[PDB]
Design a binder for these strands. Structure first.
Ligand SMILES: O=C(NO)c1cc2c3ccccc3n(Cc3ccc(F)cc3)c2cn1
Ligand SMILES: O=C(NO)c1cc2c3ccccc3n(Cc3ccc(F)cc3)c2cn1
Ligand SMILES: [Mg+2]
Ligand SMILES: [Mg+2]
Ligand SMILES: [Mg+2]
Ligand SMILES: [Mg+2]
Ligand SMILES: [N+]
Ligand SMILES: [N+]
Ligand SMILES: [Zn+2]
Ligand SMILES: [Zn+2]
Lengths: 184, 368, 368, 184
DNA sequence: TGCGAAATTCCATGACA
DNA sequence: ATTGTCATGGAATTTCGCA
DNA sequence: TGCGAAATTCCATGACA
DNA sequence: ATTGTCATGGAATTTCGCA
């Protein structure tokens, strides 16, 4: 079997609902399977429509051979299937209630959820503007298993924004109570 | 003047006036019998005035002015006095064209890495499409990989919105642009500093300098044109298609597509190259690093037979940018302060401000 | 198609398919093991479709299209099928630029006599001066002698008023103009016929053809500019001065002023040449006739290394005159009917009308 | 003494008042002394002003060394003198009541008066339009004394409008009575 | 029958949008 | 059925003044 | 060890206003 | 303180298939 490559597989999923930011509520998350590279797209809904609009941007840069998702309504619609067929993209679904990715991708998705949460608290409404920096962080984050960041694996070069501080990512005692005040 | 001519009339030799012709008085004026005929020798004190009258009839250059003077007069080294005046005629100096070409162009080194340098620029206005009139074009210098964003105006604000999206992917060391309003605003300066991006600007009114992106503009417009033949010019929905189409197109001299130069492997697009299927990603990136260094680089062409190259201290004139009708095409002479490279200079513009300027927007002031 | 490939798989030799490579079946497709890798050999009946898909991604030319195909496929003489499609892509044909230069320019003979040929043309619009916006410029071909008339519009009616005044002096055999509205109107046609004047027209959108007068426009504007430096652009009162100034200016290559070529003697203007003072008028006109015949005439320059020259029956394309944004720069192919001279042709424009056209507004249709 | 040349001398004079044509009343007549070449200019008055305007046109083509005139008010004004001085033109006047030109010029002026009269009758009001053709006639008219037309002497070439019909120039019996009807 | 310097000629360059 | 042109100012070449 | 034809490379041309 | 570029399709040159 041939070695794993970038564009072999994109793992997609939604995150939200979130607090409104510039009128957006969700985040489509795309992670390349081989590199761990992450693209984020703000949507107004987890619909087929919003997914198609967002992936249209991404797929005008690179097209994946296979997209992997859970059985979210947006991903199992025949519209979304029609869309993928047009681009020669094979669709792939995890079985219901049993999501499987790969270690790399599961770990990556965890970082994303946690990183978002950390930065949303204090400014739960200003996250739209923060998406670019969130991505650069995730993509210039060192992979313990491989010797390299997703940036390095995607482009074959060091980045001009190396994130030297392997960060806390954990909620400080202040932020813990600040988050228990926003929910109330 | 009158002393020179006096000593002349009595047959004494004066330096400049050949001894073999006969010089005489007639009608109260010193004359001489030269092969072509009899000419008046005016006193030196009259000569500047004469050259000036001859020149001013039609503001003529060297020979056309001389030919008028030679009709009536003769003196030693006429053209030397003609040229003296040509170099002092403010009107000729700023109105005439140059007859000396720029030195041969520079071919700057290709950026070493993707994201080392972006070249950005606007295209438009275009026929309105979904209320959009311009396209922001961003070209990575090393790869040629290009991003396209439709905008309503070539504004800083639309530039910033688009680049925030782009730089989600990676942040470049340098962004190179022309001196458009969009890119020279202090709002854009701040946006760049905030991210550790260095702003580099073309000399004014010299699009060659953004050649990388200008040239990409051509392909973009050309492909849009073909796709729009016999349909209305709805280009908005085609930008994404054009972007993808061009990033995946071979450059015959390089034998690579910009996508390949950026990622070292084709994505799932038609006719994807399969050559590295058996390499590991790491082996693939290794062959990529090697491909990127060995790419064809063109060299500086031969100078044309009558080119000029700038020298510190030279009097030179900057081209007027947007000259009004019936107004001069050149500014007043100014001085070459520093020679940044053979095609770029700093001049002091008689005001005097320092300006960094392409030699293509300069002529060397004539007659010293 | 399938027969060819069948006979191939069992080791029989087919013309085109080199015998030394191994051809096999796999995944239901005929393959071959070539130095660069394993490629699919599609059946001939599939090949046109493939070339078309490759070409249509970015509407690429020969090599850029080939490089996509070679990624997946191999067959005999691939580029031959690529080129076949390039010559049938209406969109590429009318959108692409030419990469072949026009043949070297003609240098028509100087008219033999003053008044044999006029070249006329308008300059403007200019800043309003006394309510005037244009200048009618009339240049006698042989002498360069020029007349200037200020007008409010480049109209037939203002042309006729001015020429009625001019032709009070003499009537020319021929008037040469471009295809401006002013000169192509039937009112102007009648005005000419009435006087036995023959109208000659430039090919469309080719000002080189009125080069004689276009060039005179330059001197006129240039002298007006100099005279107007640091004053408001009141050019109306300067036309008479400019006219006189230029008619009395030497051409350094000829060594004569247009006035001299017209009259064979200077009028009472500054620096009047006195050389023929002792000749009779008749002796003077005799030396004039001789001066007029021996004037320097330039010759046709060398062709550039990649020029084309028109041949009867050639497919060629006319340049679109005023192409809209994002619209093709070329018309559909058309046929060279007659080759009037090496730089001028009659084409049949697929409608089809006869058009007389400069080769500068033509490209030879690519790929035959 | 050096031979006579074109531009050596221009003989000028006015003709009129005439019947209004396009609002014009007079004709300034300019005849080159050596060639017999004639330029005509329609004016509204025999003033210094109208003379200056008209000669400004002519002198933007060729400047004469000397202008010759009778002692008409327009020609003896110090304005007209100032004008000539600016162009380095020497002014020359015939003595009052005793006009002298030269045979060639006297003969030429006679032709002009007669030619005008002939063509004005029947159309006394349409003469403005006829000035161009009048001039071509006069200038392509053969000089018995010299072998050549003024056109030929000015330009050193044949003309594209040779006036082959040496014309009547005399009033036909019809025109004689038509003229005795216009005066009444 | 030759030298140095002046005069003349040559001609690439750019502009008539 | 029509077609480039020519001012310009350094450089190249030729001619001049003298011997 | 050399031939004819195909493949590849070279590169003038023009256009990003 | 900055700097031309590169698709294109005939022609030139090189390589291939075969001997
Ligand atoms: O981006 C721009 N301004 O902000 C800009 C301005 C010009 C321009 C101005 C005048 C004439 C032509 C011009 N081109 C075409 C071009 C492009 C590249 C070259 F090398 C030469 C010409 C431009 C392109 N872009
Ligand atoms: O008279 C005219 N129309 O009626 C006209 C039209 C153009 C024109 C159009 C487009 C670009 C340049 C143009 N030029 C300058 C020019 C002049 C002479 C040349 F050889 C080359 C260019 C023109 C002059 N006159
Ligand atoms: Mg720009
Ligand atoms: Mg641009
Ligand atoms: Mg015109
Ligand atoms: Mg014109
Ligand atoms: N460089
Ligand atoms: N000719
Ligand atoms: Zn001047
Ligand atoms: Zn095409």
């Amino acid at each position: 079997d041939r070695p794993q490559k970038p564009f072999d597989k994109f793992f997609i999923d939604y995150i939200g609902p979130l607090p409104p930011s510039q009128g957006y509520l969700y985040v489509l998350v795309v992670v390349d399977g081989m590199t761990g590279f992450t693209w984020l797209y703000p949507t107004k809904a987890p619909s087929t429509s919003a997914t198609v609009k967002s992936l249209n941007v991404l797929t005008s840069i690179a097209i994946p051979k296979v997209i992997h998702s859970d059985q979210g309504a947006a991903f199992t619609s025949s519209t979304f299937a029609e869309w993928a067929k047009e681009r020669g993209i094979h669709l792939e679904f995890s079985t219901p209630y049993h999501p499987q990715s790969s270690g790399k991708v599961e770990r990556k998705n965890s970082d994303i959820k946690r990183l978002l949460t950390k930065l949303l608290v204090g400014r739960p409404t200003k996250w739209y503007d923060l998406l670019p920096v969130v991505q650069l962080a995730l993509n210039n984050t060192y992979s313990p298993v491989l010797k390299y960041t997703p940036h390095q694996l995607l482009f074959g070069i060091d980045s001009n924004t190396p994130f030297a501080n392997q960060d806390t990512l954990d909620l400080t005692r202040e932020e813990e109570l600040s988050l228990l005040q926003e929910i109330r | 003047l009158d002393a020179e001519l006096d000593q002349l009339l009595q047959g004494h030799y004066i330096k400049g006036y050949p001894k073999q012709y006969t010089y005489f008085l007639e009608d109260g004026k010193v004359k001489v019998s030269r092969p072509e005929g009899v000419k008046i020798i005016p006193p030196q004190s009259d000569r500047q005035k004469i050259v000036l009258q001859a020149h001013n009839l039609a503001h003529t250059g060297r020979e056309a002015t001389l030919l008028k003077i030679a009709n009536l007069y003769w003196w030693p080294n006429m053209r030397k006095d003609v040229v003296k005046q040509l170099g002092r005629c403010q009107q000729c100096l700023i109105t005439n064209a140059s007859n000396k070409a720029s030195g041969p162009i520079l071919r700057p080194d290709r950026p070493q890495k993707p994201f080392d340098k972006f070249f950005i620029d606007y295209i438009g206005p275009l026929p309105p499409s979904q209320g959009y009139l311009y396209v922001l074009v961003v070209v990575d210098g090393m790869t040629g990989f290009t991003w396209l964003y439709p905008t309503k105006a070539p504004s800083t604000s639309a530039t910033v919105k688009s680049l925030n999206v782009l730089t989600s992917i990676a942040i470049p060391k340098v962004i190179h642009s022309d001196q458009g309003a969009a890119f020279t605003s202090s709002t854009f300066a701040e946006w760049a500093k905030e991210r550790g991006i260095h702003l580099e600007f073309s000399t004014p009114y010299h699009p060659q300098s953004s050649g990388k992106v200008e040239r990409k503009n051509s392909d973009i417009k050309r492909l849009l044109t073909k796709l729009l033949v016999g349909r209305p010019t709805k280009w908005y929905d085609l930008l994404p298609v054009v972007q993808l189409a061009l990033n995946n197109t071979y450059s015959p001299v390089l034998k690579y597509t910009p996508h390949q130069l950026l990622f070292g492997i084709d994505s799932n697009t038609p006719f994807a190259n399969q050559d590295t299927l058996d390499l590991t990603r790491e082996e693939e990136l290794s062959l990529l690093q090697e491909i990127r260094t060995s790419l064809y680089h063109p060299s500086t062409p031969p100078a044309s037979s009558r080119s000029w190259s700038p020298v510190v201290g030279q009097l030179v004139q900057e081209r007027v940018a947007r000259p009004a009708s019936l107004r001069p095409r050149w500014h007043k002479p100014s001085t070459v302060l520093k020679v940044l490279n053979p095609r770029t200079v700093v001049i002091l513009d008689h005001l005097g401000n320092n300006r960094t300027v392409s030699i293509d927007n300069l002529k060397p002031t004539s007659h010293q």
